[PDB]
């Protein structure tokens, strides 16, 4: 998309985080830089602005000392930082270029938006997933078609991936979005739909990679 | 003050659709213009309309804007399925001394094949029970519309604690998928003779049941 | 009851190049409580009776607030020229309304400077009455290409006021409010006491 921000970020309560923004479709030229925040399932809120050429920063009242935005015209990059992170400040933070015009009711509009960098604040230290097999009950699923899967459990942070049989198995493979638990750890399930005749013959292994925890797990799913 | 938007509006393919953006005298009440953005789920917002009656090259011809007093309207004449998204309006507020957004509106194009859910239930594996943990898994897929309710029952009795369900999210085929997890202790799993997951969707209610045996 | 005080006793004011306007309708504007303060050094009205200020009905009443230097308040009047009047805020020759200003050095000035307040220094044409220009585009002076980057004859249209407690009253910050009255063919939303 239109400006390139940093990668995802996961932080503990009380930490501070700094994010970056670079330009696509432009060269930061005469564009004011804004920061807008989208809480989970919530509307957009603009917290800050930076004038690259003049190096003058204006922040919204809901902004406190906590948010501080700077920008280098030479480097072509723009930055923002937050301190004293808490549960509240979990969102996709956007950097966007403001545009102005001359007119009677002039109001700035954002023509270019970054990719979004989602910052998550949790007390959950990184943990590996527990992958248990979901044995197929050939008679309790479709006639002649079985449903077997894997249960990734208790993993933080969220990035995780599941491929069946080293990626050779794709049909019937439907992975489900992980859920967030009262503990703060994630858990998902990936099931596949296969013929019952191949249950005793074909071998089935889900391949899970939890890149944050650097954990790879292979588990065979055999019938009971 | 703030800008107010319909939380949700539904439209049929080909119909006109009118999304509102009303503000007090602090923002839209003065000359301050309104600006509209289209934002697909998971994508960064993109400018849709600036100055209300102007759209950047790349915004199709059916999007328009109008103003009359302290209100503002985004119109989609020939509604298409490519319009399912969030829509926010943006203007300036004098009391805020800054730009201001609206609540947003989700536009659901009501032109899709209604589909019944595919519920699949899994009992706690024997490997997990050794970990002093028991988890039931209720997979729901290929159901439209996306709104669904999940009720668990042990021995036909309603559940109370320990239930967590995900939010229906569209799949690759434009239908929706959701997951429900009943976390139990090993003693509770084997104590009850049958645990059941029940999923109601547009009157149709589907049930699956597992047993410790 | 008309809430005029909120714009006068506001925490933060806008920049002159991007002034803030607030409509004030459906209220009863008792201007007698506005003359209370002696703090408004420059209070001038244009086109209104001296006594009927509180005894008049107006369809609409707008407010326009911003911050400029003390010597530029003379430019907040019909038929004026200069950097503020041609490039930032222009009243019409037939203006109907008052103009209030007051010293805010005690608030809008920082040890070292408060450069957050800006003014437009370059513009090709003059601003039409009540037209706002917030274009942060490089100003081309003559025929030198800018490529969206500063250079010869290519300058950023905005510039910053350097407000410091140590500056002279002519260069100190002043907070301006331009109450502009409107009489339209419609029931008056704003009527005085």
Numbering used by the authors:
A (entry chain H): 2 to 225
B (entry chain L): 2 to 214
C (entry chain A): 335 to 527
Relevant lines from the article:
Each protomer within the S protein trimer comprises an S1 subunit, which facilitates binding to the cellular receptor ACE2 via a receptor-binding domain (RBD), and an S2 subunit, which drives fusion of the viral envelope with a target cell membrane and harbors a fusion peptide and transmembrane domain. Antibodies capable of neutralizing SARS-CoV-2 in vitro or in vivo are directed against the S protein. Here, we report a new member of this group of RBD core-targeting neutralizing antibodies (pT1616) with very broad reactivity. It retains neutralizing activity against the majority of VOCs and VOIs, including the Omicron subvariants BA.1, BA.2, BA.2.75.2, XBB.1.5, and EG.5.1, and to a limited extent also the VOC Delta and the Omicron variants BA.4/5, BA.4.6, and BQ.1.1.
To better understand the interaction of our strongly neutralizing antibody with the SARS-CoV-2 S protein at the atomic level, we determined the X-ray structure of a pT1616 Fab fragment in complex with a recombinant SARS-CoV-2 RBD to a resolution of 3.11 Å. The epitope targeted by pT1616 is located away from the receptor-binding motif (RBM) with a buried surface area (BSA) of 1198 Å2 divided in a heavy chain (HC) contribution of 817 Å2 (68.2%) and a light chain (LC) contribution of 381 Å2 (31.8%). The interaction is dominated by contacts of the RBD with the CDRH1, CDRH2, and CDRH3 together with residues within CDRL1 and CDRL3. The pT1616 CDRH2 is particularly hydrophobic, with residues IH52, IH54, LH55, and IH57 contributing almost a quarter of the total BSA (~247 Å2). Superposition of the pT1616-complex structure onto the SARS-CoV-2 S protein in its stabilized prefusion conformation reveals clashes between the variable region of the LC and the N-terminal domain (NTD) of the neighboring S protein protomer. These clashes are minor in the RBD “up” conformation and are more pronounced in the RBD “down” conformation. The two antibodies differ in a prominent residue (KH74 in pT1616 vs. EH74 in Ab08) within the heavy chain framework region that appears to form a salt bridge with E484 in the pT1616-complex. Eventually, comparison of the CDR backbone orientation revealed that primarily the CDRH1 backbone differs not only between pT1616 and Ab08 but also between pT1616 and the other two trimer-disrupting antibodies, and the interaction between CDRH1 and the RBD appears more extensive in the pT1616 complex than in the Ab08 complex, both in terms of buried surface area and the number of hydrogen bonds formed in the interface. In summary, the higher escape barrier of pT1616 is likely caused by several factors including the salt bridge formed by KH74.
